[PDB]
RNA sequence: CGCUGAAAGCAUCUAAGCGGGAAGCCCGCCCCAAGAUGAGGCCUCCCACGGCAGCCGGUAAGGACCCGGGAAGACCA
RNA sequence: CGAUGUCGGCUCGUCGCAUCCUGGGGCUGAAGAAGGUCCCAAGGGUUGGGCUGUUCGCCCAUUAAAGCGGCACGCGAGCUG
RNA sequence: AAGUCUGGGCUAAGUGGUAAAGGAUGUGGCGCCGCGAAGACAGCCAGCUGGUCGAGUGGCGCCGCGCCGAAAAUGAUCGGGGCUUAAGCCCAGCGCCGAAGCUGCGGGUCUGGG
């Protein structure tokens, strides 16, 4: 998981989720993955 | 780290 | 012609279900009661507000997310002794408490409000143990 | 939960499978169960026990009063085990079989007014180059202006023992029914001839 | 473009009760009830039941599609009732039954034990197949991922449980 | 990290709801503790004293003083 | 400035967490073992020596690890000097 | 001490109650394009076209209020309790409370005029 203040679709497959009151950024390529932090 | 006194040892009255 | 200033008088003893009421809402009516500032012979330096007891206390109802981000503080005077209690727990523990800590935050400081908090009587639960002084129901 | 009065008797080591195993023995029977603690009365579960039997021309009448109740003779001892609801109206040793593990509580040797080495095991201080009237003095005790005061809690000289004490889950080497004594393995609180609890362990 | 308002065919036969806050979904193969939000109003028509919405706004749309869906899972669940399969890949890997328990021998030092919870009931065709099948979707979706976490398919090898119908990508070793 | 699941016919751990998950947190262990003035509880004992919510007089159950001491202790306890 | 004693050591700690170890994780150019990087986590632990007044640092032998800071660069009505 | 006052609206973070670049299908409200009952978008059935589905769907910008970005040292806290169609924020009102300011009443001095 990265964990950036800057949470972006990397490709376009990624996919920008919003849970728990956090942004994360799901996709199928598991080096997408992020959450914002 | 090493810094000067301010006050000097102190003398018998 | 000077302040009428009235000699003791019998207190009155009140009943209040808690069920389903806002903390901070129904706390407020409480030391209002209890400071006796509904008599219009009110007076500020003796005790002559009424008894209230409460009942139901443990179905006390609160808004937002306060059951689980509500913190009770308890400082031990030791190192490290600062204990913290959420609502939620607070309520599963000692629900009583929750509504006693907000009624006695509204009360003045000092010997008098000490006294007030006396004349409170709170309990979990829909029993109360003071039959013998026939407290009014009251609807707040 | 299960548990005994009993008086620490003294120390020795016996002899098991070519090993050496200290012991200390502990003299635990017989207590009469003198009243019994319930739920409904007493809000709470346990059995007050009698220890050691006592000379009635000291038991005043309130006392008297108590142990009557129960139809049991004067007794030196009372005290509580907690959970622990007997049968009998008897407790002896044969509670307890060898291999069993037990907590056995007792009241610490007391070393008075203790320095701060002996009760906290502080270091003290140098006894040369320089050390100025401070061997066993505790140091520092805090910090400036900030907080400007000492904690709660801080270890200083002060009183030290003669306290309750448990230590845990110690073996039952042996018991001997007829003489009423317990062989506990290792080492229990306070002075021979002081008054022991002998608790079944809470360790797992 | 909805979910919510689309109607729920209901098989004979299958009766479906409402109460407040509720429905009450009886069938050939059990009973479920179905918590519903008090703003939600379930509609019981002939061979059909329908979920209404108060508002278009944000809340209530929402509310909407989960109600029905959730309703229409209840009916399909006793009758047809829901099942998940589990394949097990991997040579010294493999699965059994011991009375209603499950057993896996999946490559550690012991082998696991799963038992099976109230409405659940487990299946071993052959020793590399299991049924997790039950009227609850929720708990046998459940059921299902607690033993496939069990072992977590491989990501080097073909080498684990796994999901019917899951593909298997690998990425290369060395 | 999931299960179920809309808004958004797909998808989504979440917006309804439900799981799993730390030497950490709450309890559990050990010790103190009702001055907890919110001063709790149980068992047992004494008891209805004489004189004009007070005063005085002698008692009850008990307690203290004093003494012999103590792996208790500076004194006190 | 009609005085707020000043480095280092010793003693005694206590707090912070931007975590050295231990516990729990995601990603890996993660085969396994072992690393890298980020996240959660402050409960406990965080060795003995050679040199120098040294803090620091280098070095020896180890270690799960040999963390970094605040507390008047914590602590001289506590000691050293 | 005096309104749990009235009416419209927003916010769901305890934001209010301590901060920036920048990041985001937060929420509500505008504006502008693209595609679509000559059948679009999503899914199922093929090769950017075709088949049933029968509606909307995709994108850009702006405004209000919020989200992250947000780590420090003794015990915490918006002054406290506590507050969620508010006891928060924006707009519009009515009333009250509130000082040794102003008024009423009495008095003292100095100054000016009687
Ligand atoms: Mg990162
Ligand atoms: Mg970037
Ligand atoms: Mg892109
Ligand atoms: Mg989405
Ligand atoms: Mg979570
Ligand atoms: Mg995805
Ligand atoms: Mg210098
Ligand atoms: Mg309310
Ligand atoms: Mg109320
Ligand atoms: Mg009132
Ligand atoms: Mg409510
Ligand atoms: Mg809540
Ligand atoms: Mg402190
Ligand atoms: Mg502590
Ligand atoms: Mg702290
Ligand atoms: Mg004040
Ligand atoms: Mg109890
Ligand atoms: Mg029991
Ligand atoms: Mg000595
Ligand atoms: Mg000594
Ligand atoms: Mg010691
Ligand atoms: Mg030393
Ligand atoms: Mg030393
Ligand atoms: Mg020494
Ligand atoms: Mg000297
Ligand atoms: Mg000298
Ligand atoms: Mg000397
Ligand atoms: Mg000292
Ligand atoms: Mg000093
Ligand atoms: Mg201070
Ligand atoms: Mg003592
Ligand atoms: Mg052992
Ligand atoms: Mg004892
Ligand atoms: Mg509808
Ligand atoms: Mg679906
Ligand atoms: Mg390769
Ligand atoms: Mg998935
Ligand atoms: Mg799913
Ligand atoms: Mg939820
Ligand atoms: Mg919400
Ligand atoms: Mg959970
Ligand atoms: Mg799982
Ligand atoms: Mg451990
Ligand atoms: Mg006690
Ligand atoms: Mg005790
Ligand atoms: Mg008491
Ligand atoms: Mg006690
Ligand atoms: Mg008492
Ligand atoms: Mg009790
Ligand atoms: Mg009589
Ligand atoms: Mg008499
Ligand atoms: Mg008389
Ligand atoms: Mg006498
Ligand atoms: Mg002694
Ligand atoms: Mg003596
Ligand atoms: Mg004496
Ligand atoms: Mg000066
Ligand atoms: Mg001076
Ligand atoms: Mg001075
Ligand atoms: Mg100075
Ligand atoms: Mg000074
Ligand atoms: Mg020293
Ligand atoms: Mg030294
Ligand atoms: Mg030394
Ligand atoms: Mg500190
Ligand atoms: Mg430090
Ligand atoms: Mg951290
Ligand atoms: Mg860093
Ligand atoms: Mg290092
Ligand atoms: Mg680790
Ligand atoms: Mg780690
Ligand atoms: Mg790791
Ligand atoms: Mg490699
Ligand atoms: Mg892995
Ligand atoms: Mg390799
Ligand atoms: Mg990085
Ligand atoms: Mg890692
Ligand atoms: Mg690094
Ligand atoms: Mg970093
Ligand atoms: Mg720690
Ligand atoms: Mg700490
Ligand atoms: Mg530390
Ligand atoms: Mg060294
Ligand atoms: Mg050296
Ligand atoms: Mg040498
Ligand atoms: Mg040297
Ligand atoms: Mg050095
Ligand atoms: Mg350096
Ligand atoms: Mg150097
Ligand atoms: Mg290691
Ligand atoms: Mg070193
Ligand atoms: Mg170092
Ligand atoms: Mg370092
Ligand atoms: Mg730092
Ligand atoms: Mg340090
Ligand atoms: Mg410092
Ligand atoms: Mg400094
Ligand atoms: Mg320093
Ligand atoms: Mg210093
Ligand atoms: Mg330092
Ligand atoms: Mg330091
Ligand atoms: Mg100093
Ligand atoms: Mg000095
Ligand atoms: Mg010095
Ligand atoms: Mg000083
Ligand atoms: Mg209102
Ligand atoms: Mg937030
Ligand atoms: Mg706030
Ligand atoms: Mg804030
Ligand atoms: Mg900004
Ligand atoms: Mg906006
Ligand atoms: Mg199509
Ligand atoms: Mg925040
Ligand atoms: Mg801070
Ligand atoms: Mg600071
Ligand atoms: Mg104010
Ligand atoms: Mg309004
Ligand atoms: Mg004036
Ligand atoms: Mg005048
Ligand atoms: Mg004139
Ligand atoms: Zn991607």
Same mark, same amino acid.
């Given at each position: 998981? *990265? ?9 376009? *497959?990624? *996919? ?17 993955? $992020?959450? $914002?932090? | ?13 | 012609?000077? !302040? ?12 209040? &279900? ?9 706390? !407020? ?20 507000? &009424? ?6 206390? &443990? ?33 599963? !523990? ?32 829909? &029993? ?13 | ?37 319930? +739920? ?5 579960? =346990? #059995? ?21 109740? =129960? ?75 900030? +907080? ?38 290792? =080492? ?7 008054? #022991? ?8 | ?174």
């Amino acid at each position: 998981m *990265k964990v950036r203040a800057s949470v972006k679709r990397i490709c376009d *497959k990624c *996919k920008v989720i919003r849970r728990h009151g956090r942004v994360y950024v799901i996709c199928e390529n598991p080096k997408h993955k $992020q959450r $914002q932090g | 780290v090493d810094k000067p006194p301010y006050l000097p040892r102190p003398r018998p009255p | 012609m000077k !302040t009428y200033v009235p000699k003791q008088v019998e207190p009155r003893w009140v009943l209040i &279900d808690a069920e389903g009421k806002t903390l901070g809402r129904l706390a !407020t009516k409480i030391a209002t009661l209890l400071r006796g500032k509904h008599r219009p012979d009110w007076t500020p330096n003796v005790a002559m507000g &009424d008894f209230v007891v409460v009942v139901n206390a &443990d179905k006390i109802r609160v808004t937002g997310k306060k059951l689980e981000q509500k913190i009770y503080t308890r400082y031990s005077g030791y190192p490290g002794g600062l204990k913290k209690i959420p609502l939620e727990k607070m309520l599963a !523990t000692h629900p009583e408490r929750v509504l006693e800590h907000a009624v006695k935050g509204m009360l003045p400081k000092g010997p008098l409000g000490r006294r007030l908090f006396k004349r409170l009587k709170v309990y979990a639960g829909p &029993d109360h143990p003071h039959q013998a002084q026939r407290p009014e129901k009251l609807e707040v | 939960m299960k548990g005994i009065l009993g008086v620490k008797v003294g120390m020795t080591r016996i002899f098991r499978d070519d090993r050496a195993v200290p012991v200390t023995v502990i003299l635990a029977g017989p207590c009469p169960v003198v009243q019994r603690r319930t +739920p409904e009365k007493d809000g709470y579960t =346990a #059995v007050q026990l009698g220890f050691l039997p006592q000379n009635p021309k000291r038991v005043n009448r309130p006392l008297k009063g108590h142990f009557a109740k =129960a139809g049991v003779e004067p007794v030196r001892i009372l005290r509580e085990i907690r959970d622990f609801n007997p049968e009998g109206d008897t407790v002896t040793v044969e509670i307890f079989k060898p291999g069993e593990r037990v907590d056995v509580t007792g009241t610490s040797k007391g070393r008075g007014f203790a320095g701060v080495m002996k009760r906290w095991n502080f270091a003290g201080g140098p006894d040369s180059h320089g050390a100025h009237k401070i061997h066993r003095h505790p140091g520092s005790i805090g910090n400036r202006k900030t +907080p400007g005061r000492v904690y709660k809690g801080k270890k200083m000289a002060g009183h030290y023992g003669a306290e309750r004490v448990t230590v845990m889950n110690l073996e039952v080497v042996d018991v001997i029914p007829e003489e009423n004594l317990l062989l506990v393995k290792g =080492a229990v609180p306070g002075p021979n001839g002081g008054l #022991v609890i002998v608790r079944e362990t809470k360790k797992a | 473009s909805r979910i919510g308002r689309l109607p729920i065919p209901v098989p004979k036969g299958v009766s479906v009760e409402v109460a407040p806050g509720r429905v009450k979904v009886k069938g050939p193969k059990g009973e479920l009830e179905v918590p519903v939000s008090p703003e939600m109003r379930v509609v019981v028509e002939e061979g059909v039941v329908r979920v209404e919405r108060p508002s278009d706004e944000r809340r209530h749309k929402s509310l909407h599609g989960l109600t029905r869906t959730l309703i229409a899972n209840a009916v399909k669940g006793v009758s047809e009732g829901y099942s998940k399969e589990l394949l097990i890949k991997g040579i010294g890997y493999r699965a059994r039954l011991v009375g209603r328990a499950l057993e896996l021998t999946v490559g550690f030092s012991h082998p696991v034990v799963v038992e099976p919870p109230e409405g659940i009931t487990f299946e071993v065709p052959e020793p590399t197949r299991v049924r997790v099948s039950g009227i609850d979707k929720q708990k046998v979706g459940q059921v299902a991922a607690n033993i496939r976490a069990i072992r977590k398919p491989s990501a080097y090898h073909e080498k684990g449980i796994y999901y019917a119908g899951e593909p298997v990508r690998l990425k290369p070793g060395k």
